[PDB]
Structure 1
């Protein structure tokens, strides 16, 4: 069940061959060898316990996998099917040795999709979208300067009227804010700022009233405040935010959103480093970034890419991928998504191959 060995059957442990031990992908995303399918004599898949279509009889074998070793609904739909199958096969050849590890993981996910079933087709679409999105975020990093990245981030933060004082200093300030507001007190801007300023243990570049005001502004943008006015504006900490864990979570998330609006793709380890100074929060930041991902964020990313691509001119003519990327972003990731039609499946996979090929071409010929 390890994604790394896809050329071997999970059950029989032996590598796949073209005659007897034959790769057969099921609807659940697992590929088991034919001999084992015959040998099972049980309805479902031992790994997930999902029911099946019918036997080995109606299930085709993965050719896409076998390359690395050595007519139901009518003519139109099966033309679509054959084309799609061909696409997956063409992608699989990148798995022989070029692509990055996280990319090829999603490729492997794509290969294990059985295209003669609804489940497998849905999985194929999701894997397609994931591959597209990952390609976009890998094209953005090429046009993104890693050296001055932090500088740009903090610039974006300061431009919104917010401020980050550093990993320790910010913890201090936030715990002072929390101290004042944890019981439900309603303080105005100046009162909260004055309360926090005086309690700051002196370090050298001491935050002034304005800086702390900016940190408070950051907490206000994150919607931590119940804000009221009797005709001075009073701010209260919502019941769920009166813990340091929660409040800090919202704080971090807000800064991440600032990074997104400005178009900075930043890894969770880098976030843990910037915000906390250490690596302890990597999983925390991971959860934060994942929680922040809307299905509309793919399209957003495509647009951002187009912006950066408008800056440099276009040495690689990547705009040719624009109609392909827009199609990949237009498919519902939600479980509420209807199963794809045959034309949708074909167009999706075609889009995927065009895009991935484009990515490789860019990396090799333009840098």
Structure 2
């Protein structure tokens, strides 16, 4: 099940790196962008990988870039285009807290599960994204929003 989910996520250029690593990865993206700073993908990945590497040997520019792409696909960024340079990404104002960023992140993964026709219960979501059975309610409300309102 989880195997099928993560394969579907990577199929789209994104990655979930497990509960602990993803939490720290997101918190570092937020550290860089929560104040409106506008970073190229280059600089954003550099900032994050540098801090991650010592606890998480798996951290590389490729795997962090895939986390960035997950947030990008989730439309979390305001992009500033420039021909005569690299495009810059800012966190949209509504996503400059961890709660909101993490909600949108988790929503994108649930959306990928749907796209893939992979059907998943709120108890499993908690296991997969958080490693515990503490977030099934958080994950229920995320499902609710992707479905027809009551």
TM-score category (smaller protein): over 0.9
Distance 1:204 1:177 in 2: 16
Give the structure 2 partner of residue 92 of structure 1: none
Give the structure 2 partner of residue 244 of structure 1: 98
1:204 shift after superposition: 5.4
Higher RCO by CA contacts (8 Å cutoff, separation 6 or greater): 2
1:201 shift after superposition: 5.2
Q: Which has the larger radius of gyration?
A: 1
1:205 aligns with 2:66: no
Pick aligned residue for 1:262 from 106, 110, 116: 116
Could you give the per-residue CA deviations for residues 336-367 of structure 1, whole angstroms, max 9, x where no partner exists? Answer: xxxxxxxxxxxxxxxxxxxxxxxxxxxxxxx9
Could you give the per-residue CA deviations for residues 66-100 of structure 1, whole angstroms, max 9, x where no partner exists? Answer: xxxxxxxxxxxxxxxxxxxxxxxxxxxxxxxxxxx
Distance 2:22 2:71 in 1: 12
Matches within 5 A, 1:111-126: none
Judge conservation of contact 2:49–2:61 (CA < 8 Å) in 1: yes
Q: What's the TM-score once normalised by structure 2's chain length?
A: 0.94
**Relative to structure 1, is the Cα distance of residues 244 and 204 closer, same or farther in structure 2, using a 3 angstrom cutoff?**
closer
1:228 shift after superposition: 1.2
Q: What's the TM-score once normalised by structure 1's chain length?
A: 0.39
- Name the Cα RMSD after superposition: 2.9
1:203 shift after superposition: 3.4
Judge conservation of contact 2:21–2:56 (CA < 8 Å) in 1: no
1:206 shift after superposition: 2.1
The number of residues matched between the two structures is: 147
Distance 1:182 1:293 in 2: 30
1:190 shift after superposition: 0.5
SS at match of 1:287: helix
Give the structure 2 partner of residue 183 of structure 1: 35
Instruction: Pick the structure with more helix per residue.
Output: 2
1:223 aligns with 2:75: yes
Distance 1:217 1:201 in 2: 19
Distance 1:214 1:204 in 2: 15
